[PDB]
Amino acid sequence: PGDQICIGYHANNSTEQVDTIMEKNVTVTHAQDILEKTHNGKLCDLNGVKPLILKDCSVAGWLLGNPMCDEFIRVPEWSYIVERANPANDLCYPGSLNDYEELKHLLSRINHFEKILIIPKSSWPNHETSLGVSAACPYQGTPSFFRNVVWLIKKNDAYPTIKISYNNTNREDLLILWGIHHSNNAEEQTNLYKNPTTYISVGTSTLNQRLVPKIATRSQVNGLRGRMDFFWTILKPNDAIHFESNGNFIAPEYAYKIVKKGDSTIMKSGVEYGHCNTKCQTPVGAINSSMPFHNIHPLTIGECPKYVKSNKLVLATGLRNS
Amino acid sequence: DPGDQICIGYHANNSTEQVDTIMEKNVTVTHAQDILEKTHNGKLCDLNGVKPLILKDCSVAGWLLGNPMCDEFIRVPEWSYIVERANPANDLCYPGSLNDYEELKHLLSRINHFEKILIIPKSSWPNHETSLGVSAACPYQGTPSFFRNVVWLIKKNDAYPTIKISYNNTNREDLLILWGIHHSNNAEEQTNLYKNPTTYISVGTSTLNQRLVPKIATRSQVNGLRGRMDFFWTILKPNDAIHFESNGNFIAPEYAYKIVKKGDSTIMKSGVEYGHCNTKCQTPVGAINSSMPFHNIHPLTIGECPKYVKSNKLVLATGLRNSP
Amino acid sequence: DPGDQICIGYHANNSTEQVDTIMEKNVTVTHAQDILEKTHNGKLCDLNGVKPLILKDCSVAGWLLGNPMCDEFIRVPEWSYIVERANPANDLCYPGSLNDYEELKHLLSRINHFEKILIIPKSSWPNHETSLGVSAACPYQGTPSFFRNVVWLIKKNDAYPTIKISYNNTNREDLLILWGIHHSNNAEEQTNLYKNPTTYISVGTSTLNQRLVPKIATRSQVNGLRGRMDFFWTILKPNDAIHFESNGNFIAPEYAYKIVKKGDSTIMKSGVEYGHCNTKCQTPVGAINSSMPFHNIHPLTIGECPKYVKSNKLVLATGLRNS
Amino acid sequence: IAGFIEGGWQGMVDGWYGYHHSNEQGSGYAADKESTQKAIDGVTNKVNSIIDKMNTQFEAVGREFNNLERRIENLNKKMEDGFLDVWTYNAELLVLMENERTLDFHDSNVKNLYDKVRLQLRDNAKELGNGCFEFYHKCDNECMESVRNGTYDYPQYSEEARLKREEIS
Amino acid sequence: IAGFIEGGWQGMVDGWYGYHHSNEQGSGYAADKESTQKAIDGVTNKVNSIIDKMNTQFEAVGREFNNLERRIENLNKKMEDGFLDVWTYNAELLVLMENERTLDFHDSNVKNLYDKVRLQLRDNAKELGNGCFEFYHKCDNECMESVRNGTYDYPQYSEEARLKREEISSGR
Amino acid sequence: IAGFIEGGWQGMVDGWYGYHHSNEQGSGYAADKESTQKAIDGVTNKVNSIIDKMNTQFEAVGREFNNLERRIENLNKKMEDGFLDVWTYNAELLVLMENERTLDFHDSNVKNLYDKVRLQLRDNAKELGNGCFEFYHKCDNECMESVRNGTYDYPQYSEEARLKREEIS
Ligand SMILES: CC(=O)N[C@H]1[C@H](O[C@@H]2[C@@H](O)[C@H](O)O[C@H](CO)[C@@H]2O)O[C@H](CO)[C@@H](O)[C@@H]1O[C@@H]1O[C@H](CO)[C@H](O)[C@H](O[C@]2(C(=O)O)C[C@H](O)[C@@H](NC(C)=O)[C@H]([C@H](O)[C@H](O)CO)O2)[C@H]1O
Ligand SMILES: *[C@@H]1O[C@H](CO)[C@@H](O[C@@H]2O[C@H](CO)[C@@H](O[C@@H]3O[C@H](CO)[C@@H](O)[C@H](O)[C@@H]3O)[C@H](O)[C@H]2NC(C)=O)[C@H](O)[C@H]1NC(C)=O
Ligand SMILES: *[C@@H]1O[C@H](CO)[C@@H](O[C@@H]2O[C@H](CO)[C@@H](O[C@@H]3O[C@H](CO)[C@@H](O)[C@H](O)[C@@H]3O)[C@H](O)[C@H]2NC(C)=O)[C@H](O)[C@H]1NC(C)=O
Ligand SMILES: *[C@@H]1O[C@H](CO)[C@@H](O[C@@H]2O[C@H](CO)[C@@H](O[C@@H]3O[C@H](CO)[C@@H](O)[C@H](O)[C@@H]3O)[C@H](O)[C@H]2NC(C)=O)[C@H](O)[C@H]1NC(C)=O
Ligand SMILES: *[C@@H]1O[C@H](CO)[C@@H](O[C@@H]2O[C@H](CO)[C@@H](O)[C@H](O)[C@H]2NC(C)=O)[C@H](O)[C@H]1NC(C)=O
Ligand SMILES: *[C@@H]1O[C@H](CO)[C@@H](O)[C@H](O)[C@H]1NC(C)=O
Ligand SMILES: *[C@@H]1O[C@H](CO)[C@@H](O)[C@H](O)[C@H]1NC(C)=O
Ligand SMILES: *[C@@H]1O[C@H](CO)[C@@H](O)[C@H](O)[C@H]1NC(C)=O
Ligand SMILES: *[C@@H]1O[C@H](CO)[C@@H](O)[C@H](O)[C@H]1NC(C)=O
Ligand SMILES: *[C@@H]1O[C@H](CO)[C@@H](O)[C@H](O)[C@H]1NC(C)=O
Ligand SMILES: *[C@@H]1O[C@H](CO)[C@@H](O)[C@H](O)[C@H]1NC(C)=O
Structure with missing residues (x-):
């Protein structure tokens, strides 16, 4: 035979895993975390003050x-x-x-x-x-x-x-x-x-x-x-x-x-001041305000993401990978 | 002499109404329905008849x-x-x-x-x-x-x-x-x-x-x-x-x-005057209807009211995708 | 007329359980699971062993x-x-x-x-x-x-x-x-x-x-x-x-x-009698199970309780359509 | 004259989904009552469910705390702002997600109607690729209705189509 | 016995999705184990996710405000009713959406089984439009099993299928 | 994808969906730029919408109640825990639901791409059952483009394809 044409899709070496409603640990080509999970460990200025x-x-x-x-x-x-x-x-x-x-x-x-x-x-x-x-x-x-x-x-x-x-x-x-x-x-x-x-x-x-x-x-x-x-x-x-x-x-x-x-x-808080600026301060340190959710501390001051009891919020943006 | 044909198609009209989806913004549809209360009569009314x-x-x-x-x-x-x-x-x-x-x-x-x-x-x-x-x-x-x-x-x-x-x-x-x-x-x-x-x-x-x-x-x-x-x-x-x-x-x-x-x-x-009306939801700027599940008029409501939201538009697409 | 045939089909049984979808009401399915707690034991029990x-x-x-x-x-x-x-x-x-x-x-x-x-x-x-x-x-x-x-x-x-x-x-x-x-x-x-x-x-x-x-x-x-x-x-x-x-x-x-x-x-x-029981969620009318995520029994609970909702049934379809 | 592959039919105004016959006797449009009404009863339930499932009770919202009750007033602010954020976020995403489903629900109905006719005609007609079938045999207005109402008799035209299938070069 | 387009089979009592055959050796039912077990796993995970992802902690809900603390009592009332409306609305809508998702999920699995068979048979069989295929040739139990798994041999039966396909279409 | 394509093209690196061809002139991959861009734009909108639609205002959360205001403090505790549960439950389930739809969305696109090619070729090519089509005629690189562009010229090759069919079976 000869002269074939085929339909296929992208795959890569990504090992990123996301969870779905019906399946667990589904590997995908690309993912995105929407959970803030880190703090800089200092008290900062709040909106420049x-x-x-x-x-x-x-x-x-x-x-x-x-x-x-x-x-x-x-x-x-x-x-x-x-x-x-x-x-x-x-x-x-x-x-x-x-x-x-x-x-x-x-x-x-x-x-x-x-x-x-x-x-x-x-x-x-x-x-x-x-x-x-x-x-x-x-x-x-x-x-x-x-x-x-x-x-x-x-x-x-x-x-x-x-x-x-x-x-x-x-x-x-x-x-x-x-x-x-x-x-x-x-x-x-x-x-x-x-x-x-x-x-x-x-x-x-x-x-x-x-x-x-x-x-x-x-x-x-x-x-x-x-x-x-x-x-x-x-x-x-x-x-x-x-x-x-x-x-x-x-x-x-x-x-x-x-x-x-x-x-x-x-x-x-017992943490030290650090000559920084932030829009959301916690007793353990400042966090970024870009993400919609965070899990750092419930006692926040500023414009902050919604505090949740979650360790992982990863959105699947790429294809399924195998 | 030409071959007879049967075709499959769908409705299109001259509607310009638009909705948003999770993946597409600004989508034109044939028909859509709003679920957001955005108006108020600008009067002080009775509440549940009183x-x-x-x-x-x-x-x-x-x-x-x-x-x-x-x-x-x-x-x-x-x-x-x-x-x-x-x-x-x-x-x-x-x-x-x-x-x-x-x-x-x-x-x-x-x-x-x-x-x-x-x-x-x-x-x-x-x-x-x-x-x-x-x-x-x-x-x-x-x-x-x-x-x-x-x-x-x-x-x-x-x-x-x-x-x-x-x-x-x-x-x-x-x-x-x-x-x-x-x-x-x-x-x-x-x-x-x-x-x-x-x-x-x-x-x-x-x-x-x-x-x-x-x-x-x-x-x-x-x-x-x-x-x-x-x-x-x-x-x-x-x-x-x-x-x-x-x-x-x-x-x-x-x-x-x-x-x-x-x-x-x-x-x-409120300074707004009485209007000899009746309502189930009153705001300091005027009474609003309670048919829809959401409203954006005022937070200081009294009565049986829709949930207050910080949105200007909530349209549900009911018709099909349209190309006017 | 009919020759050798192969067919594609799915399970049906005698179940009459009904669930509702966003687009259809009263849909009969082969199996369903309710996630709403609706029953209490009508006694005042111990709370977490106390x-x-x-x-x-x-x-x-x-x-x-x-x-x-x-x-x-x-x-x-x-x-x-x-x-x-x-x-x-x-x-x-x-x-x-x-x-x-x-x-x-x-x-x-x-x-x-x-x-x-x-x-x-x-x-x-x-x-x-x-x-x-x-x-x-x-x-x-x-x-x-x-x-x-x-x-x-x-x-x-x-x-x-x-x-x-x-x-x-x-x-x-x-x-x-x-x-x-x-x-x-x-x-x-x-x-x-x-x-x-x-x-x-x-x-x-x-x-x-x-x-x-x-x-x-x-x-x-x-x-x-x-x-x-x-x-x-x-x-x-x-x-x-x-x-x-x-x-x-x-x-x-x-x-x-x-x-x-x-x-x-x-x-x-409450006036309910003590029952020599134990529970993780107590209500003024009785103790309830706290396994399901929702309940409709009573709002004045003590303990670890499902979220209180104004609902009669919350049943998920866990089977196929029946006909 | 176009089919679903091109786009919608401004001519068809009596239903959401339908046909367009074109034989020697003329042209016209038809609407599938069953799939339009079944789809209409669908989105109507979805709109009602989004609206009717909301539970509302009497509430009185005011500012009733003095100048030395600012901590308690702040608690009311956090509660009211918290419910504002919950309702605003859920209401907008629900509309976005359900609009995507409603539009996809329309695509599935169109494809299913095309596949229903495709199974009925089989090789008695030709798939043109635009969403239309061209018959290998003469199909009159009564022949058109048999396709629409599901009573198309394939063996009636089976030999007529096969001669036209074979002889066409 | 018709297929999925008409309705479910009360004779299928060993799985969720499967097959029904009819040849000169008799009829019978046979379920597809892989697609049934994977579907059961998915529905099980969905139900467990809706239940297990709820976070509950200890709360003591009472009425501890006297007749000169009615403003605070009203604040407690507004909070409790607000949380009631949020959970009631979310729970009702979530069940309605996931029920629609589950029933659509079953439909896709059945169609995928149908399309896998139709690809193998090609023109050796005729689609009846009810979810069943009529073979243009003799398909015994071993042949039927070759369709249920992915080992149907089209060129083996093509000559026999071709001869009988022309007789049916000519009206013989 | 839908029990159809084994799937996974490490060679394809320039797009999400597309094609692979093989003829006398050679072989190679070609991404379908249309479907990839619509999927990329659609998915990007979903991630932004899940993030953008959240409303955040200034709040100050502290512990400002003395030992004889425990009833008030318990009121604040119930409010904080209630919002903690609402957001945690909603966020966890929204991610699970949308991750399911996004992956189903990718499968839907590849299946439609396969159907568009099959809709063009019809009897001029043979479906191999793995997502590939085998042409019954000579299809050069210019012919391959027309398939990728969605403008395959069926009448051009119909006569030659029919001859090659009967020279096999
Ligand atoms: C003046 C003094 O220190 N008295 C002291 C007393 O001392 C006697 C001493 O005079 C005598 O000669 O020999 C005795 C041998 O045992 C003994 O040493 O001893 C008693 C017994 O313990 C002490 O209580 C007493 O100390 C004063 O007691 C006061 C209450 O009785 C008070 O507690 C005094 O503390 C001050 C303070 O430092 O706060 C003293 C301040 O000057 C005074 N300030 C002002 C503006 O008046 C302050 C004030 O009285 C109180 O705070 C009012 O409530 O009290 C403590 O020295
Ligand atoms: C406490 O101190 C304040 C601050 O100064 C006083 O307010 C001021 O009071 C004076 C008179 O005490 C007012 O007099 C004004 O003076 C000029 C010059 O003649 C004239 O143009 C005005 O018509 C007026 O009489 C002044 O208005 C007033 N300022 C303000 C801002 O109110 C206040 O009176 C003092 N209280 C007491 C009890 O003394
Ligand atoms: C304010 O006035 C009322 C009404 O006058 C007083 O209550 C009345 O009190 C008298 C004597 O305590 C009651 O009379 C008793 O009634 C019963 C029958 O119920 C009978 O068994 C006794 O022999 C006796 O006559 C009367 O019923 C009662 N009336 C009411 C309406 O309560 C009240 O005590 C006054 N308050 C104060 C603080 O003085
Ligand atoms: C996939 O389906 C095929 C098609 O049925 C299966 O292969 C066939 O299996 C049957 C049943 O065991 C075999 O027939 C038996 O063969 C032996 C050997 O002569 C004999 O003792 C029995 O009387 C009976 O006729 C048949 O030969 C065999 N055909 C082959 C291998 O080409 C196959 O096993 C299925 N695979 C799976 C994984 O289920
Ligand atoms: C109550 O009694 C205790 C025990 O007698 C007192 O605590 C003692 O105080 C003395 C000084 O008066 C210290 O030297 C001891 O070490 C303390 N003992 C202990 C066990 O704490 C206490 O001061 C008394 N409380 C009063 C008088 O208010
Ligand atoms: C998913 O993978 C992680 C580590 O990669 C593991 O801890 C977890 O148990 C896995 N989930 C399942 C359901 O096996
Ligand atoms: C916040 O964002 C900055 C850059 O904008 C990044 O360096 C840092 O790691 C983020 N997280 C913190 C401060 O917790
Ligand atoms: C389309 O979306 C854009 C986003 O920038 C917005 O400016 C525009 O108003 C939308 N269309 C209409 C008709 O409002
Ligand atoms: C409420 O409904 C009435 C009757 O349809 C309408 O006139 C009015 O504008 C609506 N809105 C109000 C009172 O805010
Ligand atoms: C609680 O669950 C147990 C089984 O774990 C059951 O026997 C009991 O009847 C249930 N009680 C109520 C009140 O639902
Ligand atoms: C279906 O169409 C055929 C062909 O025109 C006609 O004879 C028959 O009466 C129709 N049946 C119905 C129920 O309309």
Whole structure:
């Protein structure tokens, strides 16, 4: 015989395998993975903005000014916040910070951040401004206190009633923090503030707060049975905050100019910063956003692929191979 | 003489309608059907036959407490959802707050029966002034006034005797009752209005045990007043009694609301006008049909609605491939 | 006419099973397989080998505080989920509340180890009356009684000396501790019980700073009593101490619960009987098998369950067309 | 006059699939009622199934959280955006995949109709390659209907075709 | 006995696809083992994939929100109903699509068996249009087996087939 | 492919589908550029569509609930796990389904290519049963192109092919 013509198709040396609905491990000439499976192992900028990385400080210890915290604010803007596992510098004096979780959520992404002085220590001429010191807040083994806030004490066995106001003339929102000290017993209350029964009144256009100390026996924390409960408010421009107290007042000294344009979350990770940029950040490292799926980590920040519980998503694009 | 022939062919017409496939984009077909809802009538309609409650210039808190600057009708005994504006003009003429406001707004979003009734008439206070509880921050027709559903009790003959009153919900339905406390500015204003320097309000039901004390302090001026009035509410179940006790700063209830609730809804922020229509799916920009399984109009829907998608077109090819 | 023939054909049988396709409805096939779970055993079973805690007609609050209408010999040291009933008949017998109730119920939904222990015996109050705190609101055998796990202290010899007591958690596990405050009706009742017109309760641990004051006001009768009792709780971590100070209206702790938690669960509201069975997915109407990927039984499941769908049948054609 | 190999017939407007006879008595079009109606009932089920299987219930979507409830508001955002991504992705791919099936479903029907006629005629006609058969014998309008309605009698013309098959050079 | 175009065979009780022959030694059925077993493997894998690829974890579903947490309860309601609609729609459509795929899968296998036979026989046999071939020659049981496997010898029977093909077409 | 071609041409490297010929002038491979380009364009669209149609927006996922918000945290956990299961199940099954269709798509193209050649040649060539045709006449390289181009001139060789048929059987 002779003069034949035949119909055939392409084959190559490819060993790539894909899975189908009816058959398993079908070798094909070409394939394509649609699953992101790798991370670079560093924290990067998120859409061109560096994160705020508190090395050994919590948000509360950083905001209130723990004397051990190195509160570098060289970054006036951040896209998210990185906290480590066990921040040594937390609220050194035992107590709490009201609405802490909502406060951390608010500070997660901040467009503009500047610490300013709103009430200097000169504003308290009839109270002691330098004895507000405790061993639970050491500086160099020496008793100290939070730097952004002032613990006022009686002078000349007297604590005259405080009535001060501050008006926001800064054209930006102001984050103001203050606190109340809960003393341990009656004698300690008079040894510090000379007034057995005391109060704190805080008033803004939206805030009407009254605080009274709770004298009670408590367990020692950081060597002290006393407690300090801290509070915060966002002072809008042209609005004023009014303070009135006759004891147990942890008066503000520094505040923070705040401009917030968007929301983020706090990321807990021990990885290092790496001077990179990404659209999707994970606690173990940044990932690319091109693929539609990934399996790296569920705690992502950014525009990310859908997280799936899969180790392989390979699309067959070539012919069957044998 | 020519050979006879029989042929096999298919339909073609002059249709330009196009669909997409997984492997071919921009394919012309003879007929196709859309499954995406993309239109809205641009009106506010009834939802399942029930007209919404539309607050024009008043917020829910002002509407409930009876803000004198809120032009009221109280014609609606039932509604399916509440339409508010983003920034209601009249909310609280005297500055203050309504406790658990968001939960209360959720409670009132859909009401089966609503009727204002008088539970404590002003005759019930023979030893307290009932006509002086009036403010310039709540004007009515150029005259100072106050919230119309509560009474601001004032001392009489330089005396404010202790109030010990009780009301039993002898109606067949739940009762929404509101009351408040007035926060003074200084000691002088405290004794001018009430003559009692240290005051309290005790409120008690079978489920509620509340004690309020005024916070007399210096505050910023809001609506021309440095004082505040914080309001509270409770739902008095039938045959239960609410107990009030106060020696000053008491904003007593006068009118309560007979309320029956079956379903639940939410509050819609929209400025679009009512259109005397009916629908099963309402959006802040207008009502949409629910025939198709998908829509792209708005995410803030109320009713039985298609699934919201971020797509501009979902056409199913029903006819054959065409070459016009 | 017909010669030698060879034919091509396929299997048919007597099956009447029907499946549906995207283009045809009610297609008869030779074999089919349903992937929808539709059957339950109508019993409350163990969840992954752990018995549930079934409170017969009591609630978590009444069970914890020791309502005398609740079995106090309930000895389930470990459970995977708690079964309350729709409306338990034995809540707090004396009217009042339990603070942070819902979070407490979630915390106790699954417990690895649970043991009641005596921390403050009734002999720890030599200058107060410990056996006079009974009420008709909390009857037992018809006559007045009180919550078994807490003590209602009363004045002794027309005197209520100030209480200053602390308990240090010397155990190796967390302690669930409950206490309460009594809101009296009027000044005369306040003096009859506690002799002190102005009273307070202060509770202090490493993380707890509480000060409670009675709200003396007129209230309507609930369970025949116009007073109220508000109960609070804390988790006392090991080697931490709790400090109490009060001069009246104090419902003191007597028994606490050693507690070990290693996972979360939920409270199921059901009246179905226990069945001495086991399952990986429990529903309020019964246990279901978790092999199939879908089920249509009940949405309030606990465990590893198939996805809940609103469907009657999901049957796959695994054979050929029948005719 | 073309067949399926070339393309569609604008002339045939009474069905999806059909014939076009051309004998000495004239020309015309015919439509296969059975395969058109069977295919019509098919895509109609597919359209209805895509639409009717959707389950809808009453829902109220609003923003009901205050300024100190941003974490809970963020949970609502993630939930709503998550269902937006699921529905958008599935709806578009479902349309793409089912449109491909619907068009392929039409190609199979056309080929099956051609193969049905091919089996009926056998060697009594000639395959022209454009989707048409040219008869080796005289096929009148009644002869055309026998092809269309499945009652073509091959032995009636078997000898007439074989003489024309053999003598054609 | 007709073939696949008409319907299935109740006599085929040993496989999914197969053959039916009829010669002077009698009739009988014979199933194609290879295409039946491979089809069974494919359907088995498809059913197992639909079931095994579902991921399930421990979930405790309850109602732990009081009368002043109705907004959060509504959020839980919206989530649960949303997941219900997603699974219900996907499960119904997936079954409908895969059922159509399975039935079309059976049709292709039958046609492939038919086309393998038609290639071997060429003009030695005539297609009846019902799924059967009538031999233009005598095909005994050994000849029938040669068609069932791929060893049919066309030139052996061509002379006999040609003689009988012309008689039928001439009308004899 | 369809029980027809053993398949696999390592020699063919310039296309997915095409031909191999052998005559007096020699032998060689030739890819069918038309079918290959349509398949390549079609498959490329499928991969892009599976990727492009996914909508992704900015989200921040963290653990922002304290020890007395466990009911809220469990609500978030149920939401995350629900979306994890929806995407994992849908992605796994979509890949399995589309991989099946893509491989069936390749088989459909080769079968149609074989049918187009068979439709042209008819009785001028003999089907060998393995995807090859054996010509009954002399087909030079110009003739081979016409088959590949789909424009084979059947009347040109019909008379010569018929003579060669009867000179065999
Ligand atoms: C002043 C002092 O250190 N007292 C010390 C006491 O010391 C006596 C000593 O005076 C006497 O002469 O001889 C005794 C021989 O045993 C004995 O050494 O010993 C007791 C017993 O342990 C100590 O508790 C006590 O130490 C002070 O105790 C305070 C409570 O009673 C409190 O804990 C003090 O710590 C500080 C702190 O560092 O935080 C001290 C700070 O100056 C003070 N700051 C201010 C602004 O007042 C601070 C404050 O009191 C509390 O934080 C309020 O809650 O407490 C601790 O030194
Ligand atoms: C808190 O500080 C802010 C920031 O300065 C104050 O807002 C400003 O207040 C002044 C008067 O206190 C307003 O006066 C304006 O002055 C000019 C010059 O005469 C005139 O053109 C205007 O008509 C006006 O009177 C000024 O508008 C205002 N600025 C803004 C942006 O509101 C605020 O008053 C301070 N609060 C208190 C209680 O003092
Ligand atoms: C608010 O008012 C209602 C209605 O007046 C009060 O409920 C009523 O209470 C009385 C006395 O407790 C009940 O009378 C009793 O009824 C039964 C028959 O059911 C009978 O066995 C007794 O001898 C006795 O007469 C009356 O039925 C009951 N009515 C209703 C409708 O409940 C209620 O107590 C008041 N609330 C408060 C807090 O005071
Ligand atoms: C593929 O089909 C062919 C065609 O039937 C099979 O070959 C044939 O098998 C039969 C049955 O065994 C053989 O007939 C027997 O031969 C012996 C030897 O004379 C005799 O003892 C028996 O009475 C009977 O006639 C037949 O010769 C044989 N033909 C051949 C080999 O050309 C073949 O076995 C089938 N292959 C498979 C793998 O099933
Ligand atoms: C509760 O009691 C334990 C055990 O007695 C106390 O822990 C001991 O504390 C002392 C100092 O007071 C240390 O020297 C011991 O090493 C500790 N022992 C153990 C086993 O931890 C604990 O401080 C007490 N808690 C209080 C007083 O709040
Ligand atoms: C597919 O191949 C991989 C390794 O190449 C192997 O682990 C897996 O078991 C294979 N699948 C099957 C179904 O045999
Ligand atoms: C992301 O993409 C880059 C290039 O765009 C590549 O080098 C890297 O391996 C990818 N994966 C990561 C960073 O996990
Ligand atoms: C065809 O697809 C292209 C892709 O670029 C698009 O621009 C165009 O609008 C589509 N055709 C029509 C008629 O819209
Ligand atoms: C709903 O359907 C009506 C009646 O067919 C139509 O007029 C209207 O445009 C559709 N769309 C709406 C109301 O969005
Ligand atoms: C669960 O499956 C077992 C077999 O594994 C069966 O015996 C039992 O009846 C099933 N129970 C239910 C409730 O479906
Ligand atoms: C089928 O066509 C033939 C030939 O024209 C005709 O005799 C016969 O009546 C037709 N049958 C039907 C049912 O139309």
